[PDB]
Amino acid sequence: MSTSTEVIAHHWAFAIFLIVAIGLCCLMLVGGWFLGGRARLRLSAKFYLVAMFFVIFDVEALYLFAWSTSIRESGWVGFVEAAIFIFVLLAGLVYLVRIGALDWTP
Amino acid sequence: MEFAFYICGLIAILATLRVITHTNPVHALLYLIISLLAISGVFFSLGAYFAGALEIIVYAGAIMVLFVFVVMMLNLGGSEIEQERQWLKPQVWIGPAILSAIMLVVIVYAILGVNDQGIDGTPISAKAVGITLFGPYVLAVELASMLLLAGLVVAFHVGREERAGEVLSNRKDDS
Amino acid sequence: GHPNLRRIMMPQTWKGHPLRKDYPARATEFSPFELTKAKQDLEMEALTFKPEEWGMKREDFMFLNLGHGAFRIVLQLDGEEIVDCVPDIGYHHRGAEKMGERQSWHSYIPYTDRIEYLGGCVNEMPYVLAVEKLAGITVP
Amino acid sequence: WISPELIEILLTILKAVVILLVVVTCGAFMSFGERRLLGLFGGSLQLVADMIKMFFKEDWIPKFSDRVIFTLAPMIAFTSLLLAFAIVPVSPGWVVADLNIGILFFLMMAGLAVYAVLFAGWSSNNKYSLLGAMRASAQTLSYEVFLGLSLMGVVAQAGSFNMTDIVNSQAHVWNVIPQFFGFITFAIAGVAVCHRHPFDQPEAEQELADGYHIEYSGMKFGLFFVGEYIGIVTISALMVTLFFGGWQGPLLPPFIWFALKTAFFMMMFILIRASLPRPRYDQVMSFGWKICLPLTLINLLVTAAVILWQAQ
Amino acid sequence: MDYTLTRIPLQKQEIVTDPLEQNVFMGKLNDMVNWGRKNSIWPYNFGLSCCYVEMVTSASPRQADLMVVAGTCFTKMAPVIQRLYDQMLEPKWVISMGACANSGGMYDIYSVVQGVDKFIPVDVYIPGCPPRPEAYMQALMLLQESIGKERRPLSWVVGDQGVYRANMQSERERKRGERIAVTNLRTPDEI
Numbered sequence A: 001m002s003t004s005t006e007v008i009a010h011h012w013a014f015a016i017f018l019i020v021a022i023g024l025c026c027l028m029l030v031g032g033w034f035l036g037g038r039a040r041l042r043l044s045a046k047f048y049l050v051a052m053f054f055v056i057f058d059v060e061a062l063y064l065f066a067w068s069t070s071i072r073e074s075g076w077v078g079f080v081e082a083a084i085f086i087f088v089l090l091a092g093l094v095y096l097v098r099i100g101a102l103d104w105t106p
Numbered sequence B: 001m002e003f004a005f006y007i008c009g010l011i012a013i014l015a016t017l018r019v020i021t022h023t024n025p026v027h028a029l030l031y032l033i034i035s036l037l038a039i040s041g042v043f044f045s046l047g048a049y050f051a052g053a054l055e056i057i058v059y060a061g062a063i064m065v066l067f068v069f070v071v072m073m074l075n076l077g078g079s080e081i082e083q084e085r086q087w088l089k090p091q092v093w094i095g096p097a098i099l100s101a102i103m104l105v106v107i108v109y110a111i112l113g114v115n116d117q118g119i120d121g122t123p124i125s126a127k128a129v130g131i132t133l134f135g136p137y138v139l140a141v142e143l144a145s146m147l148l149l150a151g152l153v154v155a156f157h158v159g160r161e162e163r164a165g166e167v168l169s170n171r172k173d174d175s
Numbered sequence C: 001g002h003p004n005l006r007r008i009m010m011p012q013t014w015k016g017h018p019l020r021k022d023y024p025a026r027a028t029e030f031s032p033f034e035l036t037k038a039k040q041d042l043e044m045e046a047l048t049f050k051p052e053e054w055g056m057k058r059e060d061f062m063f064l065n066l067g068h069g070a071f072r073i074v075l076q077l078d079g080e081e082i083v084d085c086v087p088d089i090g091y092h093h094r095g096a097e098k099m100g101e102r103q104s105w106h107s108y109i110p111y112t113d114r115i116e117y118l119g120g121c122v123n124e125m126p127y128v129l130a131v132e133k134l135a136g137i138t139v140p
Numbered sequence D: 001w002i003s004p005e006l007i008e009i010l011l012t013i014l015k016a017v018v019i020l021l022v023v024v025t026c027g028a029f030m031s032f033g034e035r036r037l038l039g040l041f042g043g044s045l046q047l048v049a050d051m052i053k054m055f056f057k058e059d060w061i062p063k064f065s066d067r068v069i070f071t072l073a074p075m076i077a078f079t080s081l082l083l084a085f086a087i088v089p090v091s092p093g094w095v096v097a098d099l100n101i102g103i104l105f106f107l108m109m110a111g112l113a114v115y116a117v118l119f120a121g122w123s124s125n126n127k128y129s130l131l132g133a134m135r136a137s138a139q140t141l142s143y144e145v146f147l148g149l150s151l152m153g154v155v156a157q158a159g160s161f162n163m164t165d166i167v168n169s170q171a172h173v174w175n176v177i178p179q180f181f182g183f184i185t186f187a188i189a190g191v192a193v194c195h196r197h198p199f200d201q202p203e204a205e206q207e208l209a210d211g212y213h214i215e216y217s218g219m220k221f222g223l224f225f226v227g228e229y230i231g232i233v234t235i236s237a238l239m240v241t242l243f244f245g246g247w248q249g250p251l252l253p254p255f256i257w258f259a260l261k262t263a264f265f266m267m268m269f270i271l272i273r274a275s276l277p278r279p280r281y282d283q284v285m286s287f288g289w290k291i292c293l294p295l296t297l298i299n300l301l302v303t304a305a306v307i308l309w310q311a312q
Numbered sequence E: 001m002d003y004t005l006t007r008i009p010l011q012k013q014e015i016v017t018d019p020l021e022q023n024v025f026m027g028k029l030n031d032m033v034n035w036g037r038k039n040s041i042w043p044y045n046f047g048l049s050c051c052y053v054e055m056v057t058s059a060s061p062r063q064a065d066l067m068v069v070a071g072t073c074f075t076k077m078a079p080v081i082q083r084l085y086d087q088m089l090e091p092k093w094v095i096s097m098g099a100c101a102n103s104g105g106m107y108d109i110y111s112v113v114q115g116v117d118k119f120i121p122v123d124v125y126i127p128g129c130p131p132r133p134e135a136y137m138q139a140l141m142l143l144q145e146s147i148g149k150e151r152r153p154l155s156w157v158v159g160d161q162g163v164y165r166a167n168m169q170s171e172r173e174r175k176r177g178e179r180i181a182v183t184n185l186r187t188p189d190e191i
């Protein structure tokens, strides 16, 4: 909205804050550059495993992100479905613990 | 706030156009990151705050992270394909782009002619999405949890090394 | 019948033999041209690396120079696990013995201190005892 | 062309620049204090002298590297955790972002923060720094995976993302005592995302890996340093406004109370830096998955049960 | 006092006066730049044989704008010293610890370069087998004074692109009175 004369002030402040932080960083780099004077292999699969754990548990976390807003608007049936969601999530988690995908062991 | 939507859409189109026709993939992933940022700005311009929040939380915060992980992991620099430059030639670039432009022309002919009340304000809060997502969509979240579990299980089964060490050479068929 | 018989204290681009009596035990004039040759050699050491002069076995095997003191140790890699290594030494060569042929029996005591700096007096003990054996001195 | 609406919006702009300058200054003051009260185990002009030196130095661009992402990684490391502070209220009328998604924006910034390490590792044409950036990115992903759940504890107790709603739902009791598990998990996750001392130099357990901070010189490394410190002070501000009382106090002014509690968290961070030794990598991963994520999931379940039990 | 100008070991140096005696805003801003470079000095202690371990009791390159050459100048390690010198970025300063970095330093032999003075410029020398950490600290103060009285180009675009090193009075002439005016010392038969 652009007509409530206080949230539009907050929007202007937010946009100016963003653009002036970016401008401050740009001008700091510009001052660093201008002033001062001049003169095969492969990593692993465990990094992929932990990043895949991050993204999969992140989507299973965004489901709880959506749930946590309506935690009191929804009833106990919402608690039951979130409980079985977290239960199967922890079942997969303890599967990853007990198999050994979640350990490093250097 | 329609000007922000137009600017975000234009720079999203330009960013994904530079994604399609770039040589090395790290700048392609960076352009796709700013394309996802522009798509999130489009989401914020249409009142879908939770959608853009999930776009930079997950789509620009977990998926591109995984792509950059793989790129910096197996040390690909686009080599042995970037010396060919086959996608900067008419015989490869003209055909499929013509086919996709025909698809675009017919689908935007399908877009036009529909009645349009127009995009209004009243942004959809994440609270309403939480009510609907754990309301009529219980089976959606449970079976999507099982979908993510299945994807985790498969990519663990396929993308595990079974070797040792944090540095491994690209040996043919892993001996 | 010696594998990889090469210079261990001096670089391979060294003409004379230092501990020979005809070799002068003095620092010659420092030419920057030789130092630039050695800098260029250090720049292309990993590029023109030939693992036959080092006494190495010629796809996993990756050759790298790993730079108490400081010394290089070349390493042959099967991934992370290490299969062969020749520690390159001689980077701290002070010529203590060749200066022993130069200093007298009394002026060489600091040079006996400076071979092992943590020991010091422990390291000037054996020279003093051997010198007393030569002189026939029984200390009280 | 003076109008009251223009006066109000210009005052809001001035307040935004004031809070930006004061958070940069307080991050630099955190740097100066971390220099000061570590040696005991005016002097503030050495900070300005160091800034003058880093400004007046010759920059390096590596001849084999690419300019844009090598110079854009410090941009991410600075401004992502800088604009993470825009959501934090310091007073009833001194906030710059009153948006509906009050903490999801911090989650966006924390998700984007790993690209600084990734781009540093790729642009720095050095395989050891690349491996160290790989390890650091894996660490911050494995420890940011539960940051969202540790914050959903407070969101589930309050009912909305907005920070004003958090500090108005904390009007009777502060959130640290009902959710202490959420407090400690959020503190650990904020330390690890910010790449502070216990989760610092993950390349220390290996010698084929070096830090991603190398191959930078001058203002780029300086930007990395001050970006880490604005990140830790905005994590302190988020922690106080989400678990302690946001600008809430008996007699002192609300902004004074918020600054005092933020500095209290800063001295606590200095203390936990001085006390706890560095663990190695394997218990870092093992803890950050096995002990951290089931505990915050159980915390979310228990807080759901107790807020639905007393539902009237 | 008068300065030497280096402009674009084998280069030529000439002894001229400082350009600040020829503007008032440039004088104080150059003073602030020299103050900032003087107060915050980041060292790169080079790891060598037996002066490096002595200053241990007292970081990565290219952020440390200062090199402290400690040990003996070996002919194999001299290219490493020069390469690590060209790694660092202008402005850079050199402190030599021990006799082995100033001169040959008890090793006038085939495998020892007679100091780093042969191939890199040195700002501050410290004499003697291993100097005390307090000697290193007093060399730091002396070099801070030398940096504080300097005239370097503030930018590579506008201004004189030449470095002006000050001719400091030598420490033996400055401290001559307090050294010659020493009458008696403690006998070495006690502690």
Ligand code: SF4
Residues within 6 Å of the ligand: C114, E049, E050, E051, E070, E071, E072, E097, E098, E099, E100, E101, E105, E128, E129, E130, E131
């Ligand atoms: S001056 Fe003495 S302590 Fe220092 S490097 Fe030379 S021999 Fe070693």
